[PDB]
């Protein structure tokens, strides 16, 4: 009865999920959809139990009644006493990244430039940067700010998708799943690396994890951190080592969400699954590692140490934080208290 149906977004996550299922002895099975929004709908219908989501999607899911269950917790340095599962999350740093060689480009000269976003509706790749831009320009025409962009999830024929590349066949251009070459943290950063875009809206960790040999992938294996710069809100440019004083915002960690009535069961199963396939899991790396997918961040971000319990049994609003929730609310007024489905 404690069989948990995970929802994989796209064929690559589906593949990983199938392996997880096999190894879990069917304690976890898989449902697959083409987009995160579609997965959310599968959960709402009760045809899937849960999935890990970025804060922007948590907002969508929460408005529809879904709740936070456990949050991704990466490596920390503070509070090192507590066990990962009980350690409070620290959130991640949303940043705007450019090539150092692209001299003179600052936060204040982004207009008409080319941009790379993780996907529409995501925290670092969309909600934070576009919310800030809309705000500063006093215009809801965020589709006319950048000359061209790759913002997975937007209209494929629009300029917001002009830079997306689709899959190895050139198909699925701009789809919001790993099939799109420039999808997600890694895809958006690659979009910048290959100079397809002038700026990439990702998180701090993405830059470090795909530079100086941290990634063996063909497009990243030869990337050096010193060739990149972060754009601070005061118009200055800083080395990627100064993210703490040069970010667009602190984002709430991605987290697992499920229907309220399945929360308890999903939590129980996951806590047990990571004991087996997590960071120091009994069967990882020997049999299967839930938090690995060769930098592709499938199902979970690859830098996840463990899924941690949430203190205070927070509502989706409490988990995201009132400020972030309000920021999203305001941005969405551009394109009010009900489920978008
Ligand atoms: C522009 C950027 C500026 C920089 C800002 C810096 C902050 C960014 C961090 C992300 C924000 C988010 O984490 C805030 C948050 O979560 N707040 C708690 C709070 O909600 P608010 O809406 O913010 O009032 O109030 C709620 C109650 O009043 C409380 O529940 C909320 O949520 C939490 O605190 C959730 C937990 O912290 C989840 C993490 C695990 C911590 C506990 C350890 C586990 C042990 C539990 C054992 C059962
Ligand atoms: C874009 O600009 C809008 C408009 O200012 C921002 O929304 C505003 O956000 C602030 C801060 O979150 C809200 O202020 C208040 O917060 C305090 C708690 O500190 C609370 O006590 C007050 O009641 C109030 O909510 C302000 O209300 C809110 N304005 C509106 C109309 O909701 C938004 O944050 C900006 N977006 C980004 C990404 O910065
Ligand atoms: C930005 O993210 C990077 C990558 O996650 C962080 O670098 C890691 O820092 C941790 C300690 O916090 C070390 O355990 C790792 O060795 C680092 N990884 C790499 C590849 O360098 C960095 O600390 C983060 N910076 C900020 C400001 O949060
Ligand atoms: C599957 O879940 C059952 C239920 O308790 C548990 O006994 C078993 O150890 C689990 N097996 C795996 C490999 O997940
Ligand atoms: Fe995110
Ligand atoms: Zn800050
Ligand atoms: Zn509460």
Curated annotation (Swiss-Prot):
Q: List the disulfide bonds.
A: 7-39, 17-30, 64-339, 84-306, 116-191, 140-334, 150-164, 161-174, 232-246, 284-289
Its annotated compartments are: Secreted; Cytoplasmic granule
* Positions glycosylated per UniProt: 27, 135, 204
Q: Where is each Transferrin-like domain found? A: 4-333
The superkingdom of the source organism is Eukaryota
Which residues participate in Fe(3+) 2 binding? 54, 92, 185, 254
Q: How is it modified after translation?
A: Poly-N-acetyllactosaminic carbohydrate moiety seems to be needed for TLR4 activation.
**So where does hydrogencarbonate 2 get bound?**
118, 122, 124-125
State how it assembles.
Answer: Monomer. Found in a complex with LTF, CLU, EPPIN and SEMG1. Found in a complex with MPO and LTF; interacts directly with CP, allows Fe(3+) incorporation into LTF and activation of CP ferroxidase activity.
Q: Which family does it belong to?
A: Belongs to the transferrin family.
Q: What does this protein do?
A: Transferrins are iron binding transport proteins which can bind two Fe(3+) ions in association with the binding of an anion, usually bicarbonate. Lactoferricin binds to the bacterial surface and is crucial for the bactericidal functions. Has some antiviral activity against papillomavirus infection. N-terminal region shows strong antifungal activity against C.albicans. Contains two BBXB heparin-binding consensus sequences that appear to form the predominate functional GAG-binding site.
Name of the molecule in the record: Lactotransferrin
State which stretch of the full-length protein is shown.
361 to 705 of 708
